[PDB]
Write an enzyme that holds these catalytic residues in place. Structure first.
Site, PDB file in Angstrom:
ATOM      1  N   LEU A 203     -16.709  -9.878 -17.900  1.00 45.28           N
ATOM      2  CA  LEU A 203     -17.671  -9.068 -18.009  1.00 45.28           C
ATOM      3  C   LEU A 203     -17.688  -9.036 -19.551  1.00 45.28           C
ATOM      4  O   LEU A 203     -18.863  -9.037 -20.364  1.00 45.28           O
ATOM      5  CB  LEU A 203     -17.367  -7.461 -17.508  1.00 45.28           C
ATOM      6  CG  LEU A 203     -18.146  -6.491 -18.124  1.00 45.28           C
ATOM      7  CD1 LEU A 203     -19.544  -6.719 -17.612  1.00 45.28           C
ATOM      8  CD2 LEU A 203     -17.934  -5.132 -17.740  1.00 45.28           C
ATOM      9  N   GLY A 204     -16.717  -8.742 -20.407  1.00 46.42           N
ATOM     10  CA  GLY A 204     -16.495  -8.726 -21.788  1.00 46.42           C
ATOM     11  C   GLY A 204     -15.316  -8.819 -22.264  1.00 46.42           C
ATOM     12  O   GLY A 204     -14.356  -9.417 -22.092  1.00 46.42           O
ATOM     13  N   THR A 205     -15.013  -7.812 -23.446  1.00 44.72           N
ATOM     14  CA  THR A 205     -14.052  -8.075 -24.325  1.00 44.72           C
ATOM     15  C   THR A 205     -13.438  -6.595 -24.383  1.00 44.72           C
ATOM     16  O   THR A 205     -13.823  -5.547 -24.675  1.00 44.72           O
ATOM     17  CB  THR A 205     -14.223  -8.393 -25.648  1.00 44.72           C
ATOM     18  OG1 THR A 205     -14.928  -9.652 -25.731  1.00 44.72           O
ATOM     19  CG2 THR A 205     -13.090  -8.314 -26.389  1.00 44.72           C
ATOM     20  N   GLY A 206     -11.915  -6.403 -23.916  1.00 44.47           N
ATOM     21  CA  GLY A 206     -11.314  -5.086 -23.779  1.00 44.47           C
ATOM     22  C   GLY A 206     -10.583  -4.977 -25.349  1.00 44.47           C
ATOM     23  O   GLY A 206     -10.857  -5.630 -26.294  1.00 44.47           O
TER      24      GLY A 206
ATOM     25  N   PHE B 210      -7.363  -4.743 -25.419  1.00 47.13           N
ATOM     26  CA  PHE B 210      -6.008  -5.797 -25.648  1.00 47.13           C
ATOM     27  C   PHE B 210      -6.247  -7.306 -24.897  1.00 47.13           C
ATOM     28  O   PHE B 210      -5.318  -7.868 -25.037  1.00 47.13           O
ATOM     29  CB  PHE B 210      -4.927  -5.115 -24.401  1.00 47.13           C
ATOM     30  CG  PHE B 210      -4.298  -3.776 -24.879  1.00 47.13           C
ATOM     31  CD1 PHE B 210      -4.197  -3.705 -26.329  1.00 47.13           C
ATOM     32  CD2 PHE B 210      -4.008  -2.746 -24.234  1.00 47.13           C
ATOM     33  CE1 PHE B 210      -3.544  -2.504 -26.656  1.00 47.13           C
ATOM     34  CE2 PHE B 210      -3.432  -1.742 -24.591  1.00 47.13           C
ATOM     35  CZ  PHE B 210      -3.248  -1.381 -26.003  1.00 47.13           C
TER      36      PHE B 210
ATOM     37  N   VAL C 162     -12.577  -8.139 -20.679  1.00 43.72           N
ATOM     38  CA  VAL C 162     -12.870  -7.476 -19.472  1.00 43.72           C
ATOM     39  C   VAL C 162     -13.308  -8.483 -18.607  1.00 43.72           C
ATOM     40  O   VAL C 162     -14.340  -9.150 -18.750  1.00 43.72           O
ATOM     41  CB  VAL C 162     -14.116  -6.521 -20.019  1.00 43.72           C
ATOM     42  CG1 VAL C 162     -14.316  -5.779 -18.591  1.00 43.72           C
ATOM     43  CG2 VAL C 162     -13.324  -5.356 -20.855  1.00 43.72           C
TER      44      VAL C 162
ATOM     45  N   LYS D 134      -9.946  -4.206 -16.873  1.00 40.82           N
ATOM     46  CA  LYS D 134      -9.742  -4.016 -18.462  1.00 40.82           C
ATOM     47  C   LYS D 134      -8.269  -4.713 -18.877  1.00 40.82           C
ATOM     48  O   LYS D 134      -7.455  -4.490 -18.172  1.00 40.82           O
ATOM     49  CB  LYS D 134      -9.714  -2.746 -18.627  1.00 40.82           C
ATOM     50  CG  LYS D 134      -9.587  -2.537 -20.157  1.00 40.82           C
ATOM     51  CD  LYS D 134      -9.700  -1.040 -20.739  1.00 40.82           C
ATOM     52  CE  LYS D 134      -9.520  -0.887 -22.102  1.00 40.82           C
ATOM     53  NZ  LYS D 134      -9.472   0.289 -22.652  1.00 40.82           N
TER      54      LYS D 134
ATOM     55  N   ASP E 175     -19.132   6.588 -28.753  1.00 44.25           N
ATOM     56  CA  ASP E 175     -19.058   5.319 -28.643  1.00 44.25           C
ATOM     57  C   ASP E 175     -20.512   4.874 -28.015  1.00 44.25           C
ATOM     58  O   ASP E 175     -20.692   4.013 -27.204  1.00 44.25           O
ATOM     59  CB  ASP E 175     -18.116   4.395 -28.036  1.00 44.25           C
ATOM     60  CG  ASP E 175     -18.068   2.984 -28.199  1.00 44.25           C
ATOM     61  OD1 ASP E 175     -19.008   2.532 -28.825  1.00 44.25           O
ATOM     62  OD2 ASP E 175     -16.960   2.176 -27.541  1.00 44.25           O
TER      63      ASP E 175
END
Lengths: 564, 564
Positions: A8-11, A13, A16, A31, A92
């Site tokens: 999905l994306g970037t967490g 750590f 994602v 996550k 955010d």
């Protein structure tokens, strides 16, 4: 068997990652070392357990549909209500955090540098006005699509620059000279009703207050909200209905008081449009005129028959005059976005005009179905009527015979003769003519069914819009060219949209007025049908009257013969 | 204002010039120095006052339609009858002398070295057998299209060669070896019925008799004709009717005796086809089954439902196997002419199959129109019937009332009670069901109307025929190449004609059988309609029976009360 798909994306750590069960097909994300931030990861576990893809689509370059943004503000607004209940300042608020849910076909909006409020930008202590600010900023970057004040400005000078201006000014339009018109008013090429805009304007004046401790409304304690949330509740309570006057090509929202009749609203139609109430024909999306004792609607004027019926940007008007206006890439993207907004608006216009055509069509079919049922009813009553004249005539003549032998007994007044003669004269005096008008008008209705439509040309203009937005996409793949080329092919698309809009508009105005005349003829046909029907049934009941009246004197004078 | 157009041709003194009046548009020709031949020009004035364009068309390369040549032989045959009446031996019988007249759409044939008879070729005295010979030679050069014996032979060796052969042999086919099959029989790829061919064969044996003084028939004096003219009168009396059996894809001519019934002809159908008489459905060009008491016809078999259903030249079959048969230009033109004859025959085949489809269609529409009229008739009689049960029921119950007070007088037998009860029981016992079968089957009929047709593919195969004959035309522009190229594109046209013929044939066989089943259902629907109609009308007339029967005892027992 939870097979890993693409992420999905970037967490915080890692990445994602989106993965999926192979059998059950359950798309579940994951996550992905400080024990303060892994401890805040467990805080994320405990608190969570306890859209920009659309905005970057060049079709919505001027922004989205209004009511969809209203559903957005209801969803994310209730979410930020929920978090400020829970002592949670999200900090955010971005459409990156809004991954949609298409449940029931309805998009649900959930939460997972342009939104950095100056109390979070400069200071480490902050308040709920970070999310108030980034909330309304996110909302206006859904409304216009881009940054509400000084778009393409470096964030450092952006925070200081708005930190020194009027907080009521909710839109800073920076010109080509650098002189900025710091405005408290929204840009014009939008899809928005001003009745909703002005409370949203005051709401943004609450949101774009640069001082955090004055940002947000004062907390009204009966409803337990700041004035921001109260105004959002007003927006969720602004219940209007759009009416397109098909006779003027104008869409008007009418505010609905919670208790006003439809008929008082018809008086508002007569005030706000000038069209007289009894001739106001309100057609639904299935063309249904509502019972006015009840509380897009397609206004027709029941008395009129032939229905007669622009780019607000003058730089695109300059391009239509001379496409060789040598604009920088910013103005090229701007004005092309305006043109796409324009022709897209044209598309929705004749789209709903097609819909008003169909509402007229299906309503017309309703009247025909009613008329045919009444027709076959008249057929039934006609046949039985003529059979009743038939047998009643025979019963007359046989009783005249046998009454004549009673006059060979010479035992009755001759008023039975002239009585039954006047009865028989009534039987004389009583069709398919209006039925021929019915089947003929029906043939005209089938001809209106077979008459051609110009929706394929709307698909052509649709593909013209696709070409123009393909060109704007070519400004989006390289806004780094700083070209100055013309937009002559844009104006080509423009004037073909003009002329084809004229052709489809006049065709369905002619079709329209034909439906209007034919429907008018149907309304003319109904009362003669019903009155003639009443004359049939009354004629029947008189046949029964003189039936049992003749038989009545038959048994009574019969019992006079029984007397002595 | 008789404006000169382009000429017609070439005269004996100049050019036969065609000119035209400018106002009236009267196309009149002119015929344009020895005083013997100008004296014979005045002889041409006094005697006249007292087609090869079609043959050179490559479409008719194998020859013409048969009956059109029969009209030719009737016209020019009556003309040469007329001239041999008038002591006129024309000597010049050629299609160059036959300029057509399209009056009434009908082509009328008039008169203005291959036809040089050997008694005019070698001798200066001659007889009517020059025109007999050149007449039948012209006729066969309309039938096959080319010279009847030794085509492309030099006339000098042609006259001597046939001057030494069998005069009964009416066709000399010269092979590639030079060995000639001198035949008394016509070539096969023709459009001709053999029933007409054999008297025409004997007629050509009279015509191609090389000796002039035996050429022509012996003059039969009761009809005042040679046997040639008598046989031509037989050909004008051969009255046949073509029947295509649609269940076998075969066209059969049946000779008609001048007095035979159509029903005896149906027995001939049962003999010659095997299809049983009562199931023989004969459909016209408007699909009308003739009254069989009267004396293309489309045979259907009324009992069967699904209807199942080649190049005689084997050199073209060799080309379909291997187009690289390296033929000389003569055989290339020959075999290509055969192929055009083949595919053209295919075109006429499915053309008349389309016609049989339409005859089935329009006949079906006739049955539907009949059925709808009978339907609305049943509607009328139904409504009036139920109204008659209605009022008769009321008259029953009021007479039961008043009869009950007559039984308070106690003056009648109770058989009137049970009588009127059994009457009323008859009124109980008496619809739209078969009507639902009518409207539903009608819907199926409209579906058979909306089902697709494959006539566009017949236009495709038609254009394929146009390409193949364009190729043969390219052999006609240059027969001087002596090429040996293949005919692979010819076979391409051939097999696409095959497969497309299969597709259209099977489609309209399926459509066909659907029309057959639906028509069959209509014939099933009719007797129940009519029997139920009879039950309605009989029920009506019984309503009148017990009507005037009840009223009959009303007046009679009434007059019994009048008695004493």
């Amino acid at each position: 068997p939870w097979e890993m798909r693409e992420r999905l994306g970037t967490g915080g750590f890692g990445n994602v990652c989106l993965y999926q069960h192979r059998e059950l097909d359950l798309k579940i994300a994951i996550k992905s070392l400080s024990t303060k931030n892994r401890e805040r990861w467990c805080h994320e576990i405990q608190i969570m357990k306890k859209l920009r893809k659309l905005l970057n689509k060049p079709e919505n370059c001027c922004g989205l549909k209004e009511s969809q943004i209203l559903s957005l503000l209801s969803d994310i607004g209730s979410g930020i209500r929920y978090l400020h209940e829970n002592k949670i300042i999200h900090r955010d608020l971005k459409p990156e955090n809004i991954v949609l849910q298409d449940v029931g076909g309805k998009i649900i909006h959930k939460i997972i540098l342009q939104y950095l409020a100056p109390e979070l930008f400069e200071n480490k202590p902050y308040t709920a006005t970070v999310d108030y600010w980034s909330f309304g900023t996110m909302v206006f970057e859904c409304i216009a699509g881009y940054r509400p004040f000084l778009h393409h400005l470096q964030p450092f000078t952006w925070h200081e620059k708005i930190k020194k201006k009027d907080p009521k000014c909710i839109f800073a339009c920076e010109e080509m000279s650098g002189e900025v018109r710091f405005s408290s008013h929204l840009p014009q090429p939008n899809s928005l009703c001003s009745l909703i805009v002005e409370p949203m304007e005051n709401w943004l004046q609450l949101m774009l207050n640069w001082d955090p401790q004055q940002r947000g409304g004062p907390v009204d304690l009966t409803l337990k909200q700041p004035r921001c949330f109260v105004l959002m509740d007003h927006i969720l309570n602004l219940k209007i209905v759009h009416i397109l006057n098909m006779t003027s090509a104008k869409i008007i929202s009418f505010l609905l008081p919670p208790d006003e009749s439809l008929h008082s609203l018809q008086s508002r139609i007569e005030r706000e449009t000038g069209i007289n109430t009894g001739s106001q024909e309100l057609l639904s999306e299935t063309g249904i005129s509502l019972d006015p004792r009840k509380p897009m609607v397609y206004l027709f004027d029941k008395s009129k028959t032939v229905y007669e019926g622009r780019s607000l940007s003058d730089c695109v008007n300059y391009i239509v005059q001379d496409s060789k206006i040598q604009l920088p890439i910013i103005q090229l993207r701007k004005v092309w976005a305006e043109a796409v907004h324009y022709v897209s608006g044209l598309k929705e216009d004749y789209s709903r005009l097609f819909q008003g055509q169909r509402a007229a069509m299906l309503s017309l079919l309703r009247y025909n179905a009613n008329l045919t049922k009444m027709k076959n009813t008249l057929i039934s009553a006609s046949q039985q009527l003529k059979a009743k004249l038939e047998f009643f005539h025979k019963s007359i003549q046989l009783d005249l015979e046998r009454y004549s032998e009673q006059m060979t007994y010479g035992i009755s007044s001759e008023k039975m003769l002239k009585a039954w003669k006047e009865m028989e004269e009534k039987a004389i005096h009583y069709i398919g003519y209006l039925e021929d008008q019915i089947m003929s008008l029906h043939a005209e209705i089938m001809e209106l069914q077979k008459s051609p439509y110009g929706r394929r040309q709307g698909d052509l203009m649709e593909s013209l819009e696709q070409r123009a937005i393909d060109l704007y996409k070519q400004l989006k793949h390289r806004p780094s060219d700083h070209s100055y080329s013309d937009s002559t092919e844009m104006v080509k698309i423009i004037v073909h949209t003009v002329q084809s809009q004229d052709r489809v508009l006049k065709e369905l105005f002619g079709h329209l007025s034909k439906l209007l005349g034919c429907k008018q003829k149907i309304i003319d046909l109904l009362p003669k049908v019903e009155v003639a029907l009443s004359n049939i049934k009354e004629a029947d009941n008189t046949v029964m009257f003189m039936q049992g009246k003749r038989q009545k004197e038959i048994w009574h004078l019969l019992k006079i013969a029984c007397t002595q």
